Amino acid sequence: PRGSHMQKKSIYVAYTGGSGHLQRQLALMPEFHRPEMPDFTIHEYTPLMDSSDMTPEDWQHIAEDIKAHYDDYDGFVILHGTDTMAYTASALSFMLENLGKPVIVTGSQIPLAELRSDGQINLLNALYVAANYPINEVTLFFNNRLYRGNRTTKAHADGFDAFASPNLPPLLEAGIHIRRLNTPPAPHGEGELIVHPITPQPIGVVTIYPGISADVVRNFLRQPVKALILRSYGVGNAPQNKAFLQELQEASDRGIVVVNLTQCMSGKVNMALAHAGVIGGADMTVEATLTKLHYLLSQELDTETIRKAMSQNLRGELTPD
Amino acid sequence: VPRGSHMQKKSIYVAYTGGHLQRQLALMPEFHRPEMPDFTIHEYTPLMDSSDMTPEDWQHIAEDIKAHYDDYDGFVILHGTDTMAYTASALSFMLENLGKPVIVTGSQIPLAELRSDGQINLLNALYVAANYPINEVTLFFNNRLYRGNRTTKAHADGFDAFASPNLPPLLEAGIHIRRLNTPPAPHGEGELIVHPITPQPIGVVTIYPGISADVVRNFLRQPVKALILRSYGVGNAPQNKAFLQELQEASDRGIVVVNLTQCMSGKVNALAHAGVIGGADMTVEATLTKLHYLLSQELDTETIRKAMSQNLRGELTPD
Amino acid sequence: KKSIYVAYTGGQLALMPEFHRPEMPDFTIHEYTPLMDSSDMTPEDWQHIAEDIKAHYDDYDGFVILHGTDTMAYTASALSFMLENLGKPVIVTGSQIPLAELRSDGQINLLNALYVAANYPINEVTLFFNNRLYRGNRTTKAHADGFDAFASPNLPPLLEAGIHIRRLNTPPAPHGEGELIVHPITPQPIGVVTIYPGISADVVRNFLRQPVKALILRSYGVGNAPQNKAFLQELQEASDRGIVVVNLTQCMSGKVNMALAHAGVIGGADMTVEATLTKLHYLLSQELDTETIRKAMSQNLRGELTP
Amino acid sequence: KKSIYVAYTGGTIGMEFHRPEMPDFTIHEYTPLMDSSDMTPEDWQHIAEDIKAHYDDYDGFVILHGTDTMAYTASALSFMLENLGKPVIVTGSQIPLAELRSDGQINLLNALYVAANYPINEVTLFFNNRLYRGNRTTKAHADGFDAFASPNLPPLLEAGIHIRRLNTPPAPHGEGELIVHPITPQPIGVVTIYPGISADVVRNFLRQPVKALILRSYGVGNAPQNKAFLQELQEASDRGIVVVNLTQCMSGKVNALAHAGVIGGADMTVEATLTKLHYLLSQELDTETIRKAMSQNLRGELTP
Numbered sequence A: 001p002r003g004s005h006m007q008k009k010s011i012y013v014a015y016t017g018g019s020g021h022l023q024r025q026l027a028l029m030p031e032f033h034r035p036e037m038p039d040f041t042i043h044e045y046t047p048l049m050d051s052s053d054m055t056p057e058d059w060q061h062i063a064e065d066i067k068a069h070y071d072d073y074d075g076f077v078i079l080h081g082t083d084t085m086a087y088t089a090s091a092l093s094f095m096l097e098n099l100g101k102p103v104i105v106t107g108s109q110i111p112l113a114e115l116r117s118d119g120q121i122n123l124l125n126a127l128y129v130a131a132n133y134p135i136n137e138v139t140l141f142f143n144n145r146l147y148r149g150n151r152t153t154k155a156h157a158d159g160f161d162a163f164a165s166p167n168l169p170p171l172l173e174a175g176i177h178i179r180r181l182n183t184p185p186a187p188h189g190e191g192e193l194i195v196h197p198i199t200p201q202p203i204g205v206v207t208i209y210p211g212i213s214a215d216v217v218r219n220f221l222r223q224p225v226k227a228l229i230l231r232s233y234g235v236g237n238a239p240q241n242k243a244f245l246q247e248l249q250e251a252s253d254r255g256i257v258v259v260n261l262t263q264c265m266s267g268k269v270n271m272a273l274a275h276a277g278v279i280g281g282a283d284m285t286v287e288a289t290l291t292k293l294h295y296l297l298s299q300e301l302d303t304e305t306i307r308k309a310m311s312q313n314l315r316g317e318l319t320p321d
Numbered sequence B: 001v002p003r004g005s006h007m008q009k010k011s012i013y014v015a016y017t018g019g020h021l022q023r024q025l026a027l028m029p030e031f032h033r034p035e036m037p038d039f040t041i042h043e044y045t046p047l048m049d050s051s052d053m054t055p056e057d058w059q060h061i062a063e064d065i066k067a068h069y070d071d072y073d074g075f076v077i078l079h080g081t082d083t084m085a086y087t088a089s090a091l092s093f094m095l096e097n098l099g100k101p102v103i104v105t106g107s108q109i110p111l112a113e114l115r116s117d118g119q120i121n122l123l124n125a126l127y128v129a130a131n132y133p134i135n136e137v138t139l140f141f142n143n144r145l146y147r148g149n150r151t152t153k154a155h156a157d158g159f160d161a162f163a164s165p166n167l168p169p170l171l172e173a174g175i176h177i178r179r180l181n182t183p184p185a186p187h188g189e190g191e192l193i194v195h196p197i198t199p200q201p202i203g204v205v206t207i208y209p210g211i212s213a214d215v216v217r218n219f220l221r222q223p224v225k226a227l228i229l230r231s232y233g234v235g236n237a238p239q240n241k242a243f244l245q246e247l248q249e250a251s252d253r254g255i256v257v258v259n260l261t262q263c264m265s266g267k268v269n270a271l272a273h274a275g276v277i278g279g280a281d282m283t284v285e286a287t288l289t290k291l292h293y294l295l296s297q298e299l300d301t302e303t304i305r306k307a308m309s310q311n312l313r314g315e316l317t318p319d
Numbered sequence C: 001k002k003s004i005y006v007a008y009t010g011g012q013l014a015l016m017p018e019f020h021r022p023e024m025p026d027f028t029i030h031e032y033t034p035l036m037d038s039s040d041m042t043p044e045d046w047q048h049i050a051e052d053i054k055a056h057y058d059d060y061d062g063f064v065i066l067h068g069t070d071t072m073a074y075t076a077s078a079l080s081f082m083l084e085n086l087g088k089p090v091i092v093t094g095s096q097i098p099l100a101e102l103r104s105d106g107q108i109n110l111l112n113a114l115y116v117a118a119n120y121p122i123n124e125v126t127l128f129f130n131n132r133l134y135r136g137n138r139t140t141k142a143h144a145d146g147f148d149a150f151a152s153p154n155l156p157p158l159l160e161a162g163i164h165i166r167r168l169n170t171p172p173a174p175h176g177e178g179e180l181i182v183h184p185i186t187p188q189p190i191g192v193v194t195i196y197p198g199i200s201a202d203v204v205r206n207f208l209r210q211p212v213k214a215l216i217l218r219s220y221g222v223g224n225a226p227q228n229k230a231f232l233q234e235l236q237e238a239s240d241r242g243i244v245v246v247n248l249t250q251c252m253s254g255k256v257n258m259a260l261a262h263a264g265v266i267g268g269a270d271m272t273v274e275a276t277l278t279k280l281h282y283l284l285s286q287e288l289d290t291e292t293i294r295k296a297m298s299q300n301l302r303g304e305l306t307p
Numbered sequence D: 001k002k003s004i005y006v007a008y009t010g011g012t013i014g015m016e017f018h019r020p021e022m023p024d025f026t027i028h029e030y031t032p033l034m035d036s037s038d039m040t041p042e043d044w045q046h047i048a049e050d051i052k053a054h055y056d057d058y059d060g061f062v063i064l065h066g067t068d069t070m071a072y073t074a075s076a077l078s079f080m081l082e083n084l085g086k087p088v089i090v091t092g093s094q095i096p097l098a099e100l101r102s103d104g105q106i107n108l109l110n111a112l113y114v115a116a117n118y119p120i121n122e123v124t125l126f127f128n129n130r131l132y133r134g135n136r137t138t139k140a141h142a143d144g145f146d147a148f149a150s151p152n153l154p155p156l157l158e159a160g161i162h163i164r165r166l167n168t169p170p171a172p173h174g175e176g177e178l179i180v181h182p183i184t185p186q187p188i189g190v191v192t193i194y195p196g197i198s199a200d201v202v203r204n205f206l207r208q209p210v211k212a213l214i215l216r217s218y219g220v221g222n223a224p225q226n227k228a229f230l231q232e233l234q235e236a237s238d239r240g241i242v243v244v245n246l247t248q249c250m251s252g253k254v255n256a257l258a259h260a261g262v263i264g265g266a267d268m269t270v271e272a273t274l275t276k277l278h279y280l281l282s283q284e285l286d287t288e289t290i291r292k293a294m295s296q297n298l299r300g301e302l303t304p
């Protein structure tokens, strides 16, 4: 949407990490205080966190912070470390039902306090976008592009273009003008914001590679697994090993949700593993699939319902057949 | 990329590992023109879907190249796409004193099917092997020749299936074949030496929020001599004491722990004090195969750790 | 089983068994006489092709135009305007390497064009190259030596080919329903002026002799030229004499957003030179007054510009 | 501590910096300040002579410039400056520094930082985290922050968390005292080849006022073989006019027209070719020497 510019918006900034130094730095930067910029309020988290140290509880914290302040602001910017920004953006998309205001995750590759920082520009753009292009999704702003949150990954560890959306175009691109792209809408509810709990869930993340043993699937099966993510080859292939397919069939028998993804940057799983109870994850990222599992396992649903929900497009994270 | 002489008719050996072909090729005139090298196809028995490959299969192919080395001018390895990058990476370490091209290629669509990329990937690989005899294990796909141990299958559904995220291509094909100025890998001299491999239990942990110290403990049970960590960004992992202790325990037991980025591109830069070795800008495919190579040698733990961070074959960018 | 007409205009198949496979549509090839290097094409050649499609329209399910790459984007662009109410796909394609030469891309672009025309029909003049289908009047030859020879700078492709073929969510062109209309053209003198440091009023003055009905300006950025008083006056003198003067960007991508406007100059939005030139040949060939032509140039007729 | 000279010539940009990691810098605001769309070749001269005056007293040079003709200026400076021993970096912004979301501050900060810490002794163009060879650039994207491209050459340097020099082959590079070549007005035409072009266009440029003609031809340098066209081109060369054939395409290399006197410009941009012509026409060289020099790699502008 191209939102109206008639009244001065108020944006809430959840400074999660990524004391008082940010807020003072922004005070000192005139760009942030111009007439064309929305008003904003910073909530600095205590303690501030390196995003590498994040757990699902942290997603919950942030979602509760949004719900607390929802009626009081026009939009939300989540300032976050880059390392797991994509996991947080993906988690929020599932947790937040009936979301009728923009939530934009952003941050920087270089600290605001350093030289050549991208923080100023990413945060300025996020605020301006949240105020003027109020897309009702959890999104991620980086390097002049706004992405669907649950479509992103950090693709480039050293680049300012750190984030990609390998299976979906950006929602918006910033140049001389801000351009909205033809990207199709996610499913949308109606009424007041509902936060669905995401709790800790033991989920294993198996990379498929030559020489991987059945012992891996057997080892996960011992306890730390209610779900298992397979990063398989290409369009979702794995070794045809009888013991391997046995241990997977066994897993699904014990009520473990086994989800097949591609280890590739882009592409779509096309489903043998299906006969072993494995569910296809279509073109979902690991970040979307991990958080979607956390979401569903923490909800009031049985194993069959979770399995079916995993291949369904819930929030724009997957492209239906 | 050397621009090799055209003056005489080359002979290329084709290892058809998997991924009827010979009859199809007999039936395609382009493969038999005067400008094309002569070629000889060894069809493997059985043919393999590359998804079913194990390190033993890398060994088999390396022995195949060694057996036929003196007899041909170059080698094209026809291979399934799913694990092409692991095979290409494995060969780069296993072959030392490589004085002839070895080019891995295949297709996203079968030669028999409609709209196949097989004809053009194989035609180009043969032509390149004959005329641009780069002495490395390379991977040809979709008009680019890549350093093998720099590749991954990045695009599951695209004809541009392979990328080389941390190194430009060695060569690009258009109206003209253009060799790029990518710096050369380290090179030995004399007859080809195959460094063999034997099975090595290696874990691949992905770092993701909520991952516990009980994960590293789990790998430390029976099936692990090395652990690869797919860490965040420039090599970051949870810094909680339980996690860092499990890692130090692992290294105290002689497990080689190597820190990579889970990101498509970039370079890894705490964990060090816990015995974790940085894998710089290496792919999982390079790192996994490098470990298979190094662990199969009679090398002490300290030597393997050191060698992991060293550029042995062009797979990493030194400081 | 679909049947595709192939116009081989210039820019063997029996010796390749893939083309005759059961999955392929039926196709017929008409070899043109003479066969032409696309560098040699005149606007009348666009007419010959348009009329050839017209003759064959009712009897085939789609159309493939085999064409040299040098001016393929001009032909695609022209056909888009000349064909109105198009109800079947017309796909222009070719090769960077001659079919007779090694490593040729000709066979695979043709097979793809045939397959796509049959199985994923899009009722527009399109250009297929290197696994992508582009809107014809958004194209240019951007890469003289590459197999990815063509780009569509201001519009995503309409379709992409991998293991599967995927239609993209690219916004449709304004599309008329009804009987196919084929608009003939007649020769029109049009000049193309590139804006560059040290350009003189003389250039614009020269075109104002006797050989010009329209002038295309390839100006800087979003449509700027030096503010030289003599230059501006020559441009005003151009429009006074009924010459249609259209401002484009010389840049590969972007949108003109304009003075020149005071001098009678019309903004061409994000139109390529190829779309602008052919659109001018189209409009000038009709029974339209100068003011109606000037208005229509800035309107989106066939998906060639973004309003 | 390094000291960088900044020539503020004008442009969009003008319509952390003093922190301890930054080099010292001095800004000279030109009078008048110019929209780069208004630039004439004599303005290249004023800039080259400004760099000449300040050369000895600074470690690097940053040229602040409008984007519309930045690539023409960068290209010109590369020919006019010979034996360059310090970095000259041209940059600017798509959004005025006064406007919101401006790229001005970050392009300038980067250009200053790069000139000081990663010096490359070439006329370069810095934009959107990349440093390009000046005479290989074009403004490719009118509306984008990634405004500039270098279609036939990779960038020389890229900035991320770290700044890295890339393995781009160096330009031919003279050692010795800096030589600054003045230029003088030269009438040059630029002809685009397109279907339905007439011999009259070439005939008109042969009216009185042209010393050179640049052809933007198809593909690898083709044009229609119209007898009248080919004859007018030949007449132009007979009159001593330098006719150079370029590709109208964004990338690639030019490879009867030759029989008509036309010189192949290889993979040179229009910007490089035009300015190279201004340079060579301004020196005291035979038409034949000029014709030969046009196809030679003088400053890294073409691939031999």
Ligand SMILES: NC(=O)C[C@H](N)C(=O)O
Pocket: A152, A153, A231, A262, A263, A264, A265, A266, A284, A285, A286, A287, B262
């Ligand atoms: N973010 C992603 O999931 C990228 C890729 N599919 C991976 O397995 O890591």
Ligand SMILES: NC(=O)C[C@H](N)C(=O)O
Pocket: B151, B152, B230, B261, B262, B263, B264, B265, B282, B283, B284, B285
């Ligand atoms: N091939 C690769 O290693 C890509 C990426 N670094 C990953 O962890 O999967």
Ligand SMILES: NC(=O)C[C@H](N)C(=O)O
Pocket: C139, C140, C141, C218, C248, C249, C250, C251, C252, C253, C271, C272, C273, C274
């Ligand atoms: N095809 C094009 O028109 C590209 C660009 N606008 C040019 O002036 O050449």
Ligand SMILES: NC(=O)C[C@H](N)C(=O)O
Pocket: D137, D138, D139, D216, D247, D248, D249, D250, D251, D268, D269, D270, D271
């Ligand atoms: N800068 C350039 O020269 C791009 C392209 N060769 C053109 O003719 O416009």
Ligand SMILES: N[C@@H](CC(=O)O)C(=O)O
Pocket: A017, A018, A049, A050, A051, A052, A080, A081, A082, A083, A084, A107, A108, A109, A110, A111, B233, B236
């Ligand atoms: N490791 C840091 C990187 C950063 O954002 O500065 C984080 O993601 O929290």
Ligand SMILES: N[C@@H](CC(=O)O)C(=O)O
Pocket: A234, A237, B018, B019, B048, B049, B050, B051, B079, B080, B081, B082, B083, B106, B107, B108, B109, B110
């Ligand atoms: N799964 C197949 C894919 C292919 O190459 O066709 C393989 O890797 O062998």
Ligand SMILES: N[C@@H](CC(=O)O)C(=O)O
Pocket: C010, C011, C036, C037, C038, C039, C067, C068, C069, C070, C071, C094, C095, C096, C097, C098, D219, D222
């Ligand atoms: N010069 C040729 C190039 C080709 O298409 O093969 C043409 O455009 O007609």
Ligand SMILES: [Cl-]
Pocket: A155, A156, A157, A158, A159, B265, B266, B267
């Ligand atoms: Cl990176």
Ligand SMILES: [Cl-]
Pocket: A266, A267, A268, B154, B155, B156, B157, B158
């Ligand atoms: Cl893909």
Ligand SMILES: [Cl-]
Pocket: C142, C143, C144, C145, C146, D251, D252, D253
């Ligand atoms: Cl090219």
Ligand SMILES: [Cl-]
Pocket: C253, C254, C255, D140, D141, D142, D143, D144
């Ligand atoms: Cl643009």
